[PDB]
Amino acid sequence: PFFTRGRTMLVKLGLEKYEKNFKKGLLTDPTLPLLTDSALKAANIPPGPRLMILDHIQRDPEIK
Ligand SMILES: [Cl-]
């Protein structure tokens, strides 16, 4: 599976520690535009980082 775009976002946000969480929950690159707070919660990502991720998806034009 492709996790490279998700990695790029996390590095940009200083949240690379959650690469594992994405891989574990199968939050592959095609899921990036679809990410929800519930999905990230199921991936064991704490509240703060959830906000930064969901805000990045809403703003980055390179997120399909
Ligand atoms: Cl929580």
Numbering used by the authors: 194 to 257
What is written in the article reporting this PDB entry?
The Aps235Ala mutant would eliminate the salt bridge interaction between the carboxylate group of Asp235 and the side chains of Lys234 and Arg243 of a neighboring monomer. The crystal structure of the Tric1 SAM Asp235Ala mutant was determined and refined to 2.07 Å resolution revealing an identical fold and lattice packing to that of the wild-type (WT) protein. None of these displayed the same thermal stability as the WT protein, suggesting this mutation has severely crippled the ability of the protein to form a stable, discrete oligomeric species in solution. No mobility shift bands were observed for the Tric1 SAM variants Asp235Ala, Gly241Glu, or the double variant Asp235Ala:Gly241Glu suggesting the abolishment of the tRNA-binding capacity. EMSA assays, carried out using Asp235Ala and Gly241Glu mutants, reveal, in both cases, abolished RNA binding capability.
Named Tric1 and Tric2 (tRNA import component 1 and tRNA import component 2), these almost identical proteins belong to the preprotein and amino acid transporters (PRAT) family of proteins but are distinct from other PRATs in that they also contain a C-terminal SAM (sterile-alpha-motif) domain. The mitochondrial outer membrane proteins, Tric1 and Tric2, contain a C-terminal SAM domain that is required for the efficient uptake of tRNA into plant mitochondria. The protein adopts a characteristic fold consisting of a 5-alpha-helical bundle.
